[PDB]
Design a protein around this ligand. Structure first.
Ligand SMILES: CC(C)[C@H](C)[C@@H](O)[C@H](O)[C@@H](C)[C@H]1CC[C@H]2[C@@H]3COC(=O)[C@H]4C[C@H](O)[C@H](O)C[C@]4(C)[C@H]3CC[C@]12C
Ligand SMILES: Nc1ncnc2c1ncn2[C@@H]1O[C@H](COP(=O)(O)OP(=O)(O)NP(=O)(O)O)[C@@H](O)[C@H]1O
Ligand SMILES: Nc1ncnc2c1ncn2[C@@H]1O[C@H](COP(=O)(O)OP(=O)(O)NP(=O)(O)O)[C@@H](O)[C@H]1O
Ligand SMILES: [Mg+2]
Ligand SMILES: [Mg+2]
Length: 1165
């Protein structure tokens, strides 16, 4: 394991302004931490004066007034200190992390490629530049400030408590570890159970994704019920674990409240004892209690900052490892010859290169090549041969280990590297389009070029096409969408950027076969205008290229068999605001679906009120005890203290029990609602039709994200909302009742100021959490730009565009920096204002209590009880942070779930209408005058008045070009889609009237590219029939001939398959799909081009399956190749979305002889 760097090195990028910001933030954090208990000290002084000076009214008034002014001063100090701390720390962290990322990227680009090969790899580099960067940022921005603040709080609290009453300081210090340990155990248990629940829900989402991706087969069968069962089982596990999480949370809250109650019972009794012996005052006792508790909790809260410190030390050690690494291969040597002879006469001879990762494996064996000037040369590289390797050696990506490698007769390492890479132009198979605009991509090709050069490169170098037809034109961010560009267009953009680097030799790479001819002809015309551009990769396709290049040589085992011009080089491997009333109605709908759990809810509700009451009750007790401390009769003091302590001890157990009950029952109700919603959501999705599935915004991963997110935030927005609204209502109700019946005037004033103090305490809790936004989202654009640059480092080195990439990264990062600065300023100012208002309200209320006492309106006891009870109950109510307030997004997610459930499918998966279902289908599907138009693309309409025939005891074959919708034909066979105007007779009647599920169970199909379902081959094969037993799957395997390699598998039918399982061959998976089709034993066997996407033994297997299919009922088989359609007796025609003839191939030749398919047959020969 690598060793983390020392703490100081974290601040390597800190400049003078950063040091100033860090100092100011440290001072602010220290002042904040010290001010938290200093207020308690001032409160103790005020209370002691206001209680002792009852007889002397005027002195009491002046004392209370001066201490209220002290409260205002403390409020202002907290305002300023919190503002400075938050703003300075956040902005300094951002300012340092930005420079760190810039240096990291700059160091990364100008490294060697073999460095990425041997040492840290590109994926690790990206993972670092995201996670380690954000980790160090959060550690040095907020964690450090919080650590300083909490250490200050701890020290100041200890000092205040001890110097006030060392005795209670010692006792409370003994108390604190209990509460700290309880809180730590609670947090740890919650985190562990949260991780467990997260992984369980991830599993359930995995079932969701695998179902939605594979919806084709799922609807082809009746397996939606199976998917629902699997989802229900996963959700059952998740909900049982969820029950456990709720119980743990309830026990944690109950235990901490129990220990708090007992501990304050003991502390209050001891404080009464101390006051009785004239050791101290009541106010000093209370202040010591609170201050010592605050200090201990502050140390507890400070520890996580140390954890983050260690993690950031490791992360920054990694980052500095990449940063400090020195480029091994010397680059940009000043010995650059700067040859004026751009023509490369001779190069790449006696080349003995070996790949760095495996130096023993010598890829290139004494390679020699000429590449004469004035003429283009092509290379026939084998797949195992290093065509990319020799290209890299040309580009100087790697240095040849020995060998007489040279260029134009003047070597490579002699004449610099930047200039040489400028001389050579490269195109790549994968276009290198970064996040920036396409015009900026052209600039990245050659920054010296102006806009007119870009236009002409879009005019003469390439044709004017969609690359210009973007709505923004050339100023369009290709990275943000990507799907907008086809792939040929971005390839032509790369061609253009290469055209900018016109001079001297220009290497060419291979292009995919599935590429437009326009890009290809642009490539060859670039070749014609660039005779000095050579090394075109034929790859047995686009033979015009090999026509252009006279010198052609093949490459194998790091050597060339022949050297010279064109020859017989073929057959040697050649191949191819929003409304709220609807919110109330939908809330009623949710509650209605939550009806069965009502009992639990009711019980939970009951627990809530009791919990709330006890919280407020607790406050009152403190109040009363404080009021008792300033009483002359010490015996009456003893009686009151004993009564209150006994009552507190008695109610501690009630607090424990009712916290557990409330949380357990509320969380159980939520889990049931969540699972119930999930099931209904999945069922509604499955009832929908694929015309909705293929539509964008219905992708499998996106659907699963919808399912998870909406479910969880709905359960929050119901359960947490009800629990909060009931519990805090009861708490403030009983608190205000006590306050009113004691002194309604002071109670009314404090009720008026109540929302302010509640908001301030909520903000204190949020500050404890941290005000930093979602940094990864803020840096997302620069993040993905840097990731693309790092992954595509070869292309960046090819155009030596590291400086431009760094500049674009800086430009991307700048607006997030400014936004972060302003967000920090706003957050600091708002938090400070809230705290100042809180302390001003404290001062106002307490001074008003003094004023009431002056006029004889009330007494010290009643006023102090009212003030203390209402303020502590306000803190208890602002403890609202315990339950997550996701309601804001909860409403949107809830309208989302209701619109998804309320969405109607036009094709009913099950037809309610009566249908004349036969046991054995008549198997004579009758396509006639079909004019199907694809819904997704109304422009493309495959079918024009198509009429087809079926053969009951026989089979029909179909053949055509890849363009024709044969898979569309089989889709319309099973009512997968809906024809625009065509009509089809499956059973002497419309398919639309007859039940769809009966159609599914009566028709078996194979997909063109079948993929398997689950762990065991047994279940995947048995999927075809609802009762496959064991024998039926036996002959299903044998007739399909899958059984031989199934037995070759370790455990056969139980062998785990999938991404993590034994990944069978395409032929094997297609054959077992055939086996499943046989399992279904259906009337119509739809054997699509899977009968061609296979191998020779699978080809005889398919011929045998055709034998059985013609023997048993009927089949529609499509296969563009020959020798398979000949098996079927009757063969149809599907050319250009039209039928031309139908019958046997002998019949297809007796009338309408030859044909496009016959020409294909001659070709396949
Ligand atoms: C004198 C008060 C009215 C004062 C003005 C008030 O603002 C002050 O912040 C009060 C409400 C705080 C000061 C110390 C706090 C306590 C800190 O010490 C404790 O024992 C902790 C333990 C545990 O965290 C409890 O959940 C809260 C609990 C029990 C806190 C309850 C609220 C306080 C009692
Ligand atoms: N990242 C790599 N790690 C190890 N060996 C590599 C790497 N890249 C290429 N090679 C080796 O380089 C040789 C040729 O590269 P390879 O990727 O097999 O084919 P290619 O030159 O890209 N041609 P093709 O397969 O038709 O696309 C083989 O010996 C590879 O093992
Ligand atoms: N959702 C869709 N919306 C619009 N057009 C579609 C859709 N799905 C497929 N197509 C069209 O269907 C045609 C493809 O025909 P298809 O029968 O799927 O053969 P293929 O998959 O291209 N070749 P092959 O694998 O040999 O069967 C193209 O015109 C596609 O654009
Ligand atoms: Mg290659
Ligand atoms: Mg098709």
């Amino acid at each position: 394991e690598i060793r983390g760097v020392a703490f100081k090195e974290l601040f390597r990028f800190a400049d003078g302004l950063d040091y100033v910001l860090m100092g100011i933030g440290s001072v602010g954090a220290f002042v904040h931490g010290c001010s938290l208990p200093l207020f308690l000290r001032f409160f103790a002084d005020l209370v002691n004066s206001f209680g002792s000076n009852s007889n002397n009214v005027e002195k009491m008034m002046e004392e209370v007034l001066k201490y209220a002014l002290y409260f205002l001063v403390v409020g202002a100090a907290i305002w300023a200190s919190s503002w400075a701390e938050i703003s300075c720390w956040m902005w300094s962290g951002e300012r340092q992390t930005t420079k760190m990322r810039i240096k990291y990227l700059e160091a990364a680009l100008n490294q060697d490629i073999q460095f990425f090969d041997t040492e840290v790899r590109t994926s690790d580099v990206v993972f670092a530049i995201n996670t380690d960067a954000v980790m160090v940022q959060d550690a040095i921005s907020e964690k450090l400030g919080n650590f300083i603040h909490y250490m200050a709080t701890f020290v100041s609290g200890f000092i205040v408590g001890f110097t006030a009453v060392w005795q209670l300081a010692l006792v409370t210090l003994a108390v604190v570890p209990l509460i700290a340990v309880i809180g730590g155990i609670h947090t740890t248990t919650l985190s562990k159970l949260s991780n467990k629940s997260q992984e369980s829900l991830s599993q359930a989402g995995n079932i969701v994704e695998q179902t939605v991706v594979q919806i084709r087969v799922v609807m082809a069968f009746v397996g939606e019920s199976r998917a629902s069962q699997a989802y229900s089982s996963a959700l059952k596990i998740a909900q049982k674990l969820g029950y456990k999480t709720g119980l743990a949370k309830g026990m944690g809250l109950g235990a901490t409240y129990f220990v708090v109650f007992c501990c304050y019972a003991l502390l209050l009794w001891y404080g009464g004892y101390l006051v009785r012996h004239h050791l101290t005052n009541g106010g000093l006792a209370i202040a010591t209690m609170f201050a010592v508790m605050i200090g201990g909790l502050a140390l507890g809260q400070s520890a996580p900052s140390m954890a983050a410190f260690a993690k950031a030390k490791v992360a920054a050690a990694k980052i500095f490892r990449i940063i400090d690494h020195k480029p091994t291969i010397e680059r940009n040597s000043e010995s650059g010859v700067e040859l004026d002879s751009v023509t490369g006469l001779v190069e790449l001879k006696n080349v003995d290169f070996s790949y760095p990762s495996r130096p023993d494996v010598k890829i290139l064996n004494n390679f020699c090549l000429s590449v004469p000037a004035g003429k283009t040369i092509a290379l026939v590289g084998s797949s195992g041969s290093g065509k990319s390797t020799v290209v890299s050696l040309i580009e100087r990506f790697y240095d040849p280990n020995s060998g007489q490698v040279l260029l134009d007769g003047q070597d490579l390492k002699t004449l610099k590297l930047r200039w040489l890479r400028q001389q050579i132009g490269l195109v790549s198979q994968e276009p290198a389009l970064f996040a920036t605009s396409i015009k900026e991509n052209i600039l990245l090709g050659r920054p010296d070029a102006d806009q007119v050069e870009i236009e002409e490169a879009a005019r003469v170098a390439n044709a004017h096409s969609f690359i210009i037809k973007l709505p923004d034109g050339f100023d369009t961010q290709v990275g943000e969408r990507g799907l907008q560009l086809s792939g040929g267009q971005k390839q032509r953009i790369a061609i253009a950027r290469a055209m900018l680097k016109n001079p001297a030799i220009l290497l060419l790479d291979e292009a995919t076969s599935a590429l437009d001819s326009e890009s290809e002809k642009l490539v060859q015309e670039a070749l014609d205008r660039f005779m000095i551009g050579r090394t075109t990769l034929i790859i047995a396709h686009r033979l015009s290229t090999i026509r252009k290049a006279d010198l052609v040589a093949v490459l194998q085992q790091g050597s060339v068999s022949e050297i010279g011009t064109h020859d017989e080089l073929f057959s040697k491997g050649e191949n191819g605001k929003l409304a709220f009333k609807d919110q109330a109605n939908s809330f009623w709908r949710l509650a209605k679906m939550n009806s069965p759990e009502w009992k639990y809810a009711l019980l939970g509700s009951v627990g809530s009120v009791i919990c709330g009451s006890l919280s407020a009750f607790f406050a009152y007790v403190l109040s009363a005890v404080l009021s008792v401390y300033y009483n002359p009769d010490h015996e009456y003091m003893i009686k009151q203290i004993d009564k209150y302590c006994y009552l507190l001890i008695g109610l501690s157990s009630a607090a424990l029990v009712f916290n557990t009950l409330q949380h357990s029952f509320w969380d159980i109700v939520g889990e049931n609602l969540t699972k119930r919603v999930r099931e209904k959501m999945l069922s509604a999705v499955l009832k929908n039709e694929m015309a909705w599935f293929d539509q964008e915004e219905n992708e499998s991963a996106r659907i699963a994200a919808r399912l998870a997110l909406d479910a969880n935030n709905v359960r929050s927005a119901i359960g947490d909302r009800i629990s909060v609204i009931v519990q805090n209502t009861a708490l403030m109700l009983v608190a205000c009742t006590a306050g009113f019946v004691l002194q309604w005037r002071l109670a009314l004033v404090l009720v008026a100021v109540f929302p302010v103090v509640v908001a301030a305490t909520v903000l204190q809790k949020m500050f404890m959490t941290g005000f930093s936004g979602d940094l990864e989202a803020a840096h997302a654009k620069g993040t993905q730009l840097a990731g693309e640059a790092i992954a595509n480092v070869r292309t960046v080195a090819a155009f030596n565009s590291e400086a431009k990439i760094v500049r674009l990264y800086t430009a991307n990062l700048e607006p997030p920096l400014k936004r972060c600065f302003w967000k920090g300023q706003i957050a600091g100012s708002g938090y400070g204002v809230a705290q100042f208002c809180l302390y001003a309200s404290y001062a106002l209320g307490l001074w008003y209590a003094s004023w009431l006492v002056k006029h004889g309106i009330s007494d010290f006891s009643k006023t102090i009880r009212v003030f203390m009870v209402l303020m502590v109950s306000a803190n208890g109510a602002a403890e609202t942070l315990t339950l997550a307030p996701d309601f804001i997004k909860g409403g949107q997610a809830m309208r989302s779930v209701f619109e998804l459930l309320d969405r109607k499918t036009e094709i009913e998966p099950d037809d309610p209408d009566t249908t004349p279902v036969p046991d054995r289908l008549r198997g004579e599907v009758e396509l006639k005058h079909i004019d199907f138009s694809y819904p997704s693309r109304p422009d493309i309409q495959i079918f024009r008045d198509l009429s087809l025939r079926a053969r009951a005891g026989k089979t029909l074959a179909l053949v055509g070009p890849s363009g024709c919708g044969k898979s569309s034909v089989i889709s319309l066979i099973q009512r997968f889609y809906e024809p625009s105007s065509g009509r089809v007779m499956i059973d002497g009647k419309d398919i639309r009237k007859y039940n769809l599920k009966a159609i599914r169970k009566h028709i078996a199909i194979v997909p063109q590219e079948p993929c398997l379902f689950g762990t065991t081959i047994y279940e995947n094969i048995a999927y075809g029939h609802e009762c496959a037993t064991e024998a039926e799957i036996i002959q299903a395997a044998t007739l399909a001939s899958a059984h031989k390699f199934i037995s070759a598998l370790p455990e056969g039918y139980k062998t785990y398959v999938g991404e993590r399982g034994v990944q069978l061959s395409g032929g094997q998976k297609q054959r077992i799909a055939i086996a499943r089709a046989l399992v279904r034993k259906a009337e119509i066997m739809l054997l699509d081009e899977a009968t061609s996407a296979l191998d020779a033994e699978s080809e005889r297997s398919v011929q045998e399956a055709l034998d059985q299919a013609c023997s048993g009922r009927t089949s529609i088989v499509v296969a563009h190749r020959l020798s398979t359609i000949r098996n079927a007796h009757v063969i149809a025609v599907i050319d250009d979305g039209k039928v031309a003839e139908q019958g046997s191939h002998s019949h297809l030749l007796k009338n309408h002889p030859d044909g496009i398919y016959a020409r294909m047959i001659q070709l396949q020969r």
